[PDB]
Design goal:
The structure is cut from a larger assembly and holds 2 copies of chain A (49 residues). By secondary structure, the first copy, chain A, is an alpha+beta fold. In chain A, 24% of the residues lie in helices and 16% in strands. Chain A has 1 helix and 2 strands; from the N terminus they run βαβ. In chain A, strands 1-2 form a two-stranded parallel ribbon. Chain A starts with 8 loop residues before the first strand and ends in a 9-residue tail after the last strand. The structure holds a molecule of 2 linked components (NAG-NAG) (2 copies). A molecule of 2 linked components (NAG-NAG) binds next to loops of chain A. It is classed as membrane protein/immune system.
């Protein structure tokens, strides 16, 4: 559904557990190549993997 | 080095252990989007993940 408007820019506002799950599902579906842009909206940016 | 000739088509001839490692490194560097082609050259195609 996020490809209906051809979205290139995603802001993730989750805690230290859901950020890892969303990143793992992005890597599984393959949406981390150059052309995309993500912002992990938290204070512990290096707390995730 | 495989992006010097802009290679789109890779044939992997490895056993049941190295195929999983090469696929994991392809997923880590992000080369499994639409546009690339792969052939797992073995008899146990469904033996890997
Ligand atoms: C980082 O992600 C952003 C968003 O996709 C992109 O930044 C663009 O970088 C180019 C090259 O300097 C600029 O000309 C554009 O103005 C930037 N903003 C856009 C397209 O909104 C780019 O894809 C990524 N890389 C860099 C180096 O910025
Ligand atoms: C994914 O599968 C498609 C369809 O099976 C392949 O697309 C080929 O594209 C060429 C060039 O447009 C056309 O001859 C046909 O649309 C397809 N060829 C066939 C069916 O023999 C594509 O090569 C595959 N691999 C990718 C995208 O990496």
């Amino acid at each position: 559904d996020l490809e209906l408007k051809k979205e290139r820019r995603v802001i993730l506002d989750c805690e230290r557990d859901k950020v890892n799950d969303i990143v793992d599902q992005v890597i599984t579906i393959g949406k981390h190549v150059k052309g995309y842009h993500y912002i992990i909206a938290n204070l512990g940016f290096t707390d995730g993997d």
